[PDB]
Amino acid sequence: MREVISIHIGQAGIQVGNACWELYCLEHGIQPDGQMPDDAFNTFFSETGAGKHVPRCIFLDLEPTVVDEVRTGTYRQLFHPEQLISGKEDAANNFARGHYTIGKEIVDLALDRIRKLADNCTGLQGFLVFNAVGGGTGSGLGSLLLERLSVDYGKKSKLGFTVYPSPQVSTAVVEPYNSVLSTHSLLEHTDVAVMLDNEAIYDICRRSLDIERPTYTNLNRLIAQVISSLTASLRFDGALNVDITEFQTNLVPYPRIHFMLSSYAPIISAEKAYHEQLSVAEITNAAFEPASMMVKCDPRHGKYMACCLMYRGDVVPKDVNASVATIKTKRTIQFVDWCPTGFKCGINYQPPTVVPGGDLAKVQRAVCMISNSTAIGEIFSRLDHKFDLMYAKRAFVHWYVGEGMEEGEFSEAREDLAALEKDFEEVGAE
Amino acid sequence: MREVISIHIGQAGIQVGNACWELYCLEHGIQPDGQMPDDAFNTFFSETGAGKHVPRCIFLDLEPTVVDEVRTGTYRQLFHPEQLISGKEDAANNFARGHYTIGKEIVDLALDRIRKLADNCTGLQGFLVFNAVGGGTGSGLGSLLLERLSVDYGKKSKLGFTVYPSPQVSTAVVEPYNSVLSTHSLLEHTDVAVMLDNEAIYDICRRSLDIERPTYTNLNRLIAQVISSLTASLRFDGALNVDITEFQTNLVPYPRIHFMLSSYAPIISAEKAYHEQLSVAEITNAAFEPASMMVKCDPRHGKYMACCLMYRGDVVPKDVNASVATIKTKRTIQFVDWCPTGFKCGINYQPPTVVPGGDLAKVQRAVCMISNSTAIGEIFSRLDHKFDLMYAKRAFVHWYVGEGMEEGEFSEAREDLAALEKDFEEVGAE
Amino acid sequence: MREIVHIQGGQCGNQIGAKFWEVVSDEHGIDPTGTYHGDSDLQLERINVYFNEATGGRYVPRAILMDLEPGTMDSVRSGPYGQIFRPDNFVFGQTGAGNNWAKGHYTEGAELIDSVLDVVRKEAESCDCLQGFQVCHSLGGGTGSGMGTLLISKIREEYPDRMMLTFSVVPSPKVSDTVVEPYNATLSVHQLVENADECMVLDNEALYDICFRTLKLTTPTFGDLNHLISAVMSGITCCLRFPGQLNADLRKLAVNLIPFPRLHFFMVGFTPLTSRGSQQYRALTVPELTQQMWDAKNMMCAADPRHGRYLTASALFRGRMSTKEVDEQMLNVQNKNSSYFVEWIPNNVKSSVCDIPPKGLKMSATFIGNSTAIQEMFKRVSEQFTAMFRRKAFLHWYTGEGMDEMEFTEAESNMNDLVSEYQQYQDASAE
Amino acid sequence: MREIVHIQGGQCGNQIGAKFWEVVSDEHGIDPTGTYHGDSDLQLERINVYFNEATGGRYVPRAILMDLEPGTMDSVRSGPYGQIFRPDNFVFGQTGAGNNWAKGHYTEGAELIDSVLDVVRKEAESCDCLQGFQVCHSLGGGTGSGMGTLLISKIREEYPDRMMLTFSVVPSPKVSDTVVEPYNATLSVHQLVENADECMVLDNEALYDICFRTLKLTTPTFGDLNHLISAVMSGITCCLRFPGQLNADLRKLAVNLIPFPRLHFFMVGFTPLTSRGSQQYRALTVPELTQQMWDAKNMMCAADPRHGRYLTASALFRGRMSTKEVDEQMLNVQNKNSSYFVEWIPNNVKSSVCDIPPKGLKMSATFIGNSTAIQEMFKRVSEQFTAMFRRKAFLHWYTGEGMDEMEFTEAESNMNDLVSEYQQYQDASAE
Amino acid sequence: TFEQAQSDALLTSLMSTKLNQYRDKLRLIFRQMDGNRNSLIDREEFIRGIAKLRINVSKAQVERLFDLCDVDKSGELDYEEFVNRFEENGLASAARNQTRA
Amino acid sequence: VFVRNDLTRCGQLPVRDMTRCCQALVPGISERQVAAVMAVVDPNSAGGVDY
């Protein structure tokens, strides 16, 4: 009735999907084999003749290794064998490779399975595309799939949880290139794009979790908790029910400005747990702290446009109202003049479930703050010169040209990002 | 009361008969020794006073090897020793040899035993002739036997499950010659000719069963499953019971047009089972897929004239109606303008039994789709030029001439096949 | 229950037949004393195709051993399987033909041919059903060629419908053993064209090639060439003797191979022939067998198929194998080498499959190709025959045996007509 | 399922490849007889990348060994892991190229190159999907460099989109092993620039320095240097054969490493290289691996990075490690040595992580540096080549093999062009 | 007993036909036999894999197959012996044909 | 008849099987006579004489 189709593209998409689906299985009581010992799973799972629950997800990749890890792992009997789609040749961090030459047949098969999955849903709230902006599979194939979905499905709300390059630390060299290309691609195709930065999540793990050696599994666990907190209102009832379709209506002041910071609170280990009050006001303040943001971007630089809060657990409308009133009265947090309210509070009666073997503690309250703010143009300013600095020398441009791209396409993407910078400045302005 | 006499002519006939009778013994619980630990076997077996069940079958061949393989295999004590009829010299892929010189006495004895078998049947739905169009034993001797049966028995329904040469792959050289000759023979005698191609069944085994090295045992197992689904309504009760006599009334618009494409669904191995829904609609769609067809003939080229569906297992008439309505509303499937109904649905409560040691899995639902369509003219068009390319040079003609034929026989066969081509063109056209 | 009458003619024919019978007895588990010692039911299931039962359990070949000199079959009897043969089936004269086809066909063969026909008829009448006769002999020898052609003519007269199969060791292209090889070969090919239904052409130099290049042997004697010929002779008829997934008798092979009656000369090859070193290393698969058999080097015929065009080709596989795999491999061979295959035949391949591989081998496959390549072999033999016949060298030896000079000219004309037909069907165009 | 076709050329290439295949068999748990004995599942998951399934449980390297003399591969075949290779993959002549690139590329390698490409095609077509080819050989040698360049050209013609990886042992600066090393190197660099997609530069004297200073061996034979080179060669593709936390195939490395097409030469190194004395004293940690990685002595190339600037640098780590640790370490390296890193590339590190470290090391790392330092090596080759080419010393041999003089001048012109490219990007300023 | 010999031959032939259906299918089935990371196949892994194959065979005959596949008296099946007994044709075909033995 | 009653194609049949075969040929034959012929055919065997 409230079905949402999940897509995971690229290594990062599939690896955060592992955490997300582990989290949903733990939340709904679904064993990894597929079945559990009302109808709260329908948003993510469809039950078959044997009673087995299969997730409405699609693991897409041009590289076979990442998908075969799932085919061999504990979640081999849960996912559908044809839902796991594997390519033959990796995109090799080439947007052209993942969008123009290799990705064609794979995305055609992807649309085939997506149509099969959508025909299994009475309603369809929308799509949750989890990819990695900064790689050929993540950028190119994800952009192509988003384009195809926009063409055919039409009105389905597509939420892209994109992982963008960190400011200074990075693992790819053409990462600014394919990041700018994918940003141009999804500026018009996704409905709500959520920014995530590995450096910021690493800082969160280092300070809040006291993990001196964070890794991708830890990062994906935090991301999975954020996404589950986002979708909790679809699967569990609570005061001030929040909806996928109304994320837009309460969050996107203008269609271009749909990139969103995310921040989780509390982020505390077991040893530091039950040591502080962790009240609603304190956790809201922590969520609005710059350190808790999962993107390396100071919120104090820009002005918030909208803030949607998803509370999980024992939260009362008085507590959320008082916390938001204190936040509004606070002088450091600055909102735009044209949005006097700028707040969308929604509570859920289901506390966040804790994945065994993880570092997050069992907290009776949790906040996922997703904010549309003009400060995010600052990371775009970072990528916009990381792009053009190499583009002056046309470094690695032949690699992209070889698979059917043009200098005009890079220029158009960079120009579109400059237009986005202008847009951010204007919307921040009065 | 509903007895059906089985005839298996040639190596292909006997080899598909092995699988067919293995399947029937497994279905009715008859052990290979002959007896079982009611009256559902009457269609295929006749019980004696001792409790031993003997099949109402006749294994005809001019080569002793294949029949002695039956005499030496597991099914020795089952079949009647005189019912196994063996020749002394093979027909050597010569239609003339199998129809004019060697086949005379063998077919005379075949009529003798067929008469003895028919005298044991209170009712008699008809004959199931399984031969190999493309070999002297199957083609020539089978044609002679069909002619004699038409002369003496008269109006009994003879259903010929013929195996035609594949389009490009083949095993013989004079296969076009004896195929065209036997086609002229069986155009005027058999009542419903179910067409089969080794290339098509090989592709089915490769794609659906994941067998990259299919063998004749696999092909015969598939054919046996098709025939068992076809005859299931004779032995087991079901809603919308379908009869041997109902096949032609609901499938043959004109007497000349009685060739039938066969398609079974689902074809899934043990590993791939219980992983997809395998619902009524999905299996109907799979049956209507061109890839699942057992003739190398794309139905999209032609138009369906009639489609008879045999559903086996837990099939509910509302679901079969919904699936067939979806098929009708589908644009890709095209029916002739003069057959608005074009569908003969029949359900049976007996799920298809699975052969132990076979590749097919245990499925609770099954569809056997047998369709009269004008697309079948394509394969006759292929054989018509494969024949004339050889016949222009009169290659291998002396071999056929030596055993009592004339050039006029070849000319008449080619002319009759051209007439059949034009008849198919006319029925297809408005 | 479709019996075959084997006949050996001449020195080469007798030795090849001895090796062939050794191979067949080994395959059927028959010891040199004739008692069955094989321990496999399929071996005895169709043993009657070649053997008859004696008073005891002894099994004796249906073989008829022909010669004009006694020493050759003294050696045959002294051989490892010399005492399996019925002693009554040894028909030999006293003075051999001095490599003289005239002596072996007209003067000395006339007297002994009556006894030969008596033995052949006695062996045939005992048969329940007769598939036909197989005559192993060597073109280019006196008694071999002469008696073989005469006996083939007599058997054709007596049993026209019964199949006739010939294994003729055509004289080698480069290195000839005897001088009068062109004369004997020319006179014998004329008889084989008219009488022999199905003919295999073998070359000592082609066998030497296969044994140096595939088998990599060092000093291979005639025993090895006879061993390979025996392998082909067994594999061609293994479908009669063993159950097959798609079986094919000799008549089926002839029907699928011979487009026109005179074009019944075929080149044959056996797979897998591999050296000792790479045996662990070579992959035993249907594609590997096809790749080997379609090689020109695998042929036991001197003529290479690349020059000619494949009119027809039968492949008899042995082993538990995928019929789809076989058919796909051979269709792929046709599609890849369509330039070497005749256009006016849509399918130039006859696939037969038998379920019993030869002893020791996981798999096997024998090939029988009717291609216009043999045109160059017949052309070369004509080039030698004409060279001698222009000066009438050694012609007096044949003329003194009471054959006209006109017979030589008629044989040359017939052989040239066969060559012309092969060229015509090499360069025939569809429509 | 992304297969790699290995090729070995010349004596140096054959020895290095033999050591490499021994190392890879050890990593995959394959005994010299070919049977899998790893008792470990990830070893067999992607074994098809390098090996093929034989009839038994045996696995055969997808390696093609080439030479013009038989002694090198006689030793290779008789070596400890010589029996794994298919003997059909040994393609060699009778007369070796006398350290003559002209002989190995035009006269003697040209006849053998037909067989070489036949074997290459046979091995490649069996592959489901082909990542590409890796050729191990030495610049400065006749058969090795000549046939390697010729084969790379042919395979580039045949498979333009497939990856080409080369491991070339460039002649050492201070001591020269063969006299015509500058001619051979100059001619081979010309081919590698134009054809090879990714090329690894190695130096024997740099290997001696690293194994005497960090490893501290007393008498490192060529086996030890080949073991180092094999360690790097395995580590470069371990992300294909094993699951990785952040995996990176050869094409990903090429994309992230090569800024401009002709600047595809890299200097490589392996870590952690520890002396047996200080194995206990060292701490096996990511910061230690990075520090040893970025040392100039750890570079297997003679050119030291300090003189040049790193255009790009990939680091393939292996083992259970923190990606935060790795990324922070490489960012700290770039910030600390910003003078040695090119300004107009914001991030000069391509970090890859594989979850399966090599046997014996809990953590390991192979480093691949694209830096302008290789400029000085090409410059030294220029200084030697011009010195000999002024007086035409040893040039008449290359002239007599049918090579124009202008081929040399074209080769050195292109190599000087590459030199100046490296200089121009070293001193290129942002904006 | 000849009955037991024929049963072993038929069962080995059935398994060899079920496997080897495509290239490297023997390898894929071998990797699927063992849940654990070691290549050695345990008796329980062997019974579970045979059960995964749609073959109705008693535990006694499965144990007979396990022992016939050379354990080297170690009790675990290696890939080498797995391939050796489940090759296409070979021992399976020979045992199937040799009825009189 | 012996081949039909021999399922394993082993060429050997037990006492019960060959007595059944001999009764199918001639009804009056008892098992003792068949066993005696079995013994005189193969003196030292644990049943299963070659038919």
Ligand SMILES: Nc1nc2c(ncn2[C@@H]2O[C@H](COP(=O)(O)OP(=O)(O)OP(=O)(O)O)[C@@H](O)[C@H]2O)c(=O)[nH]1
């Ligand atoms: N947060 C997070 N990021 C990841 C993770 N795995 C990979 N990434 C990021 O994803 C980027 C590359 O992802 P992909 O493009 O999918 O890599 P791939 O699967 O080999 O596909 P291509 O590189 O495009 O050929 C890297 O820059 C990483 O920063 C993860 O587990 N967590």
Ligand SMILES: Nc1nc2c(ncn2[C@@H]2O[C@H](COP(=O)(O)OP(=O)(O)OP(=O)(O)O)[C@@H](O)[C@H]2O)c(=O)[nH]1
């Ligand atoms: N579908 C299928 N077709 C088969 C099978 N076996 C043989 N055939 C086909 O049957 C054709 C020949 O059959 P037959 O005529 O009976 O062969 P035969 O029994 O030796 O008789 P002749 O060939 O006429 O002498 C071949 O072209 C094959 O395509 C089988 O098991 N399944």
Ligand SMILES: Nc1nc2c(ncn2[C@@H]2O[C@H](COP(=O)(O)OP(=O)(O)O)[C@@H](O)[C@H]2O)c(=O)[nH]1
């Ligand atoms: N393959 C093979 N060829 C032989 C053998 N013996 C002789 N030949 C060849 O056969 C040719 C004809 O000899 P042959 O006809 O047997 O002599 P004849 O019996 O006196 O007529 C000779 O040129 C020999 O080269 C043998 O044992 N094997």
Ligand SMILES: Nc1nc2c(ncn2[C@@H]2O[C@H](COP(=O)(O)OP(=O)(O)O)[C@@H](O)[C@H]2O)c(=O)[nH]1
């Ligand atoms: N690392 C290593 N280098 C070698 C080995 N053998 C030779 N070389 C080097 O390879 C260079 C060229 O030799 P090579 O090309 O093999 O000579 P070629 O075979 O006649 O072409 C020489 O300068 C040697 O220093 C070896 O075993 N290991």
